[PDB]
């Protein structure tokens, strides 16, 4: 999409409709005449396009109105209301830009942000941008959270997020322009080696993949068209449903052999009755010959009765010879029909063990995407965020994804090594109690008007709690935390002294031996300048490889590489790194998934703020003080870095609107 309308698409907005968020800000216009709505819609799209076309510099209200044309640059309170809405909810002037109007020295209100992960940083940059006092509290000794980026010498390898899912409507597109990030595309040609290390041929490879995508659609049909979404009270998982579809396809292969052989039998029985006529008729024929001969043995001249017997017998002998010939006519067909069916049988099996083993790798990939074994993924909802896919090749970051978060952290008050242990929020403000991660006895107290919590969902889910809320989070929130899924995947980093793989191939598979180990080192990435190979441990295997030393893991990795490329071309790796996300206490997991029994609705619950009770009973309802942001709060773009970033921008506008006052709704 291109023009002003490309700006609306690139900003995740319908170019020709007012969205629900905009109506709330501008009820006068959306309840008004169709002409006004179009004016507004243009002013919106046109400002977006301006900011987009150059995102390294602030877009001031002046700059905007300058470059509108009449009739649009006529009403200047409409242009001012539009620009201010845009700027507030991070649709323009977000990320890293040069400030035209230096932020005023006197701040307004005070906000503690828990976590300098990407979502934290995003809101923190935006809140400060709005003239607020913003301090971030980070438990780790580095920013970025789940965006990690191993760096030693010339080696660079992220152990957290590493792919940008396509710039078509992606806030990361803007940040990329804003910060140089080496962006490389990903050729999608991936060949899968078998357990024995022999490359799988295209025949199986293309066949299984088509069947895989065919079994997936089958579940989606079980879900939406048969409402098979609940079984003995427990809601149906994707894994469950894939089994009920592989079983029903193995049933069908059998029902198909039965009613084929059952055509043979019926056909053979038809023959049985035909050969019984034919052998009882060759008996009447043999006996009749004994009579016509014997009757012809009465030499002529004979009485007319004796002559009648010879002719009559010779006739029933010609009658029964017509019959027997008509029956070996019918016999011919049946003999040939049998020879057809016997050498024209139907499929003998649904999936060979070698074929299914390949399929189990395709299920590993799917447990990679959602970071959890498929039994857990809600059958109805696991793919509910699929409508909001960006458009474009997926990319990697050659310099490490760590540079984005670090850039965002420029100019922000970040207290590293600071583990929040109690969040305490009351009708009159909040105080956040943190310790120092190195000597934990040393205690810190932070007072503030509002707390924005970007704690990972796995942290929020820890039992016993790793962070205490005072007062407790309400049941509608803690139920949401239980229901929601937070899964796990890990990576292994292999640093060599020479490229010994196919350099024109970014990623190549390894097929597992079992279903149970389908995730265990199932995929490798050449992504980087340097000689670095990346190994992914997904599925049920991720949670179990965390209990195994790095050597044992690097051990298995070499083995599978070895068979795939020979035992004399795979040298010992120089530097090796293994992650352990669900083991990490600041992540307790990789990212969230829609667990069975959860829905997308929970992702919205996570994002509702908490308004505390009144201190003095009889006082009026207070302000919301506790806010949430992060990957598990943005229901339309979860488990991603862009989703995190959008969540951070979202809460910054929501928090600002609360303590700075939205004067763009009049």
């Amino acid at each position: 999409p291109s023009g002003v309308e490309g700006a609306a698409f690139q900003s995740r907005l319908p170019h020709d409709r007012m969205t629900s968020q905009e109506a709330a800000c501008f009820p006068d216009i959306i309840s008004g005449p169709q002409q006004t709505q179009k004016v507004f819609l243009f002013i919106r799209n046109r400002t977006l396009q301006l900011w987009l076309d150059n995102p390294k510099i602030q877009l001031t209200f002046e700059a905007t109105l300058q470059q509108l044309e009449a009739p649009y640059n006529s009403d200047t309170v409409l242009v001012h209301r539009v620009h201010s809405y845009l700027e507030r909810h991070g649709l323009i002037n977000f990320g890293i830009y040069k400030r035209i109007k230096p932020l005023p020295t006197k701040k307004t209100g005070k906000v503690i942000i828990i976590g300098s992960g990407v979502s934290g940083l995003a809101a923190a940059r935006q809140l400060q941008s709005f003239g607020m006092d913003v301090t971030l509290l980070e438990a780790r000794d580095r920013v970025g959270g789940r965006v990690a980026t191993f760096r030693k010498g010339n080696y660079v390898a992220d152990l957290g997020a590493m792919v940008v899912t396509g710039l078509g409507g992606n806030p990361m597109a803007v940040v990329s322009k804003q910060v140089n990030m080496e962006l490389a595309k990903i050729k999608q040609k991936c060949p899968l080696y078998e357990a024995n290390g022999q490359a799988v041929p295209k025949e199986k490879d293309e066949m299984v993949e088509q069947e895989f995508n065919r079994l997936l659609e089958a579940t989606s049909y079980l879900s939406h068209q048969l409402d098979f979404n609940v079984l003995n009270n427990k809601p149906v998982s994707l894994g469950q449903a894939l089994e009920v579809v592989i079983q029903l396809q193995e049933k069908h292969v059998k029902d198909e052999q039965i009613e084929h052989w059952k055509k043979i039998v019926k056909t053979q029985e038809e023959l049985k009755e035909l050969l019984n006529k034919m052998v009882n008729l060759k008996e009447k024929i043999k006996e009749l010959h004994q009579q016509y001969k014997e009757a012809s043995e009465v030499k002529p001249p004979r009485d007319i009765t004796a002559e009648f017997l010879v002719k009559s017998k010779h006739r029933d002998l010609t009658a029964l010879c017509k019959e027997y010939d008509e029956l070996a006519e019918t016999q011919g067909k049946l003999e040939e029909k049998l020879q057809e069916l016997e050498a024209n049988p139907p499929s003998d099996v649904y999936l060979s063990s070698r074929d299914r083993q390949i399929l189990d790798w395709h299920f590993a990939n799917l447990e990679f995407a959602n970071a959890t074994p498929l039994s857990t993924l809600s059958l109805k909802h696991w793919d509910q965020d699929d409508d909001f896919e960006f458009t474009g090749s997926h990319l990697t970051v050659r310099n490490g994804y760590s540079c984005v978060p670090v850039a965002l952290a420029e100019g922000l008050d970040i207290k590293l090594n600071t583990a929040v242990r109690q969040v305490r929020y009351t009708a009159s403000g909040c105080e956040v109690i943190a310790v120092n991660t190195r000597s934990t006895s040393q205690t810190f107290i932070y007072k503030c008007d509002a707390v924005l919590c970007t704690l990972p969902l796995g942290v929020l889910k820890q039992q016993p709690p790793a962070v205490q809320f005072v007062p407790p989070l309400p049941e509608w929130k803690t139920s949401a935390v239980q229901r929601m899924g937070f899964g796990n995947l890990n990576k292994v980093v292999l640093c060599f002294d020479r490229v010994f793989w196919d350099p024109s191939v970014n990623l190549f598979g390894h097929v597992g031996s079992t279903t149970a180990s389908r995730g265990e080192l199932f995929l490798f990435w050449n992504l980087y300048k340097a000689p670095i190979l990346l190994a992914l441990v997904a599925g049920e295997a991720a949670g179990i490889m965390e209990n195994i030393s790095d050597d044992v893991i690097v051990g298995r990795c070499l083995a599978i590489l070895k068979g795939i490329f020979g035992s004399s071309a795979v040298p010992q790796p120089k530097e090796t790194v293994v992650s352990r996300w669900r083991a990490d206490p600041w992540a307790r997991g990789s990212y969230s998934y829609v667990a069975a029994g959860s829905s997308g609705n929970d992702y919205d619950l996570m994002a509702q703020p908490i308004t505390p009770g009144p201190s003095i009973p009889g006082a009026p309802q207070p302000i919301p003080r506790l806010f949430f942001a992060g990957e598990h709060t943005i229901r339309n773009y979860p488990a991603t870095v862009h989703g995190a970033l959008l969540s951070g921008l979202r809460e910054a506008g929501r928090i600002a609107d609360q303590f700075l006052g939205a004067m763009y709704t009049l």
Partner: peptide, 4 residues
């Protein structure tokens, strides 16, 4: 939810 379905990658590459």
């Amino acid at each position: 939810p379905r990658s590459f």
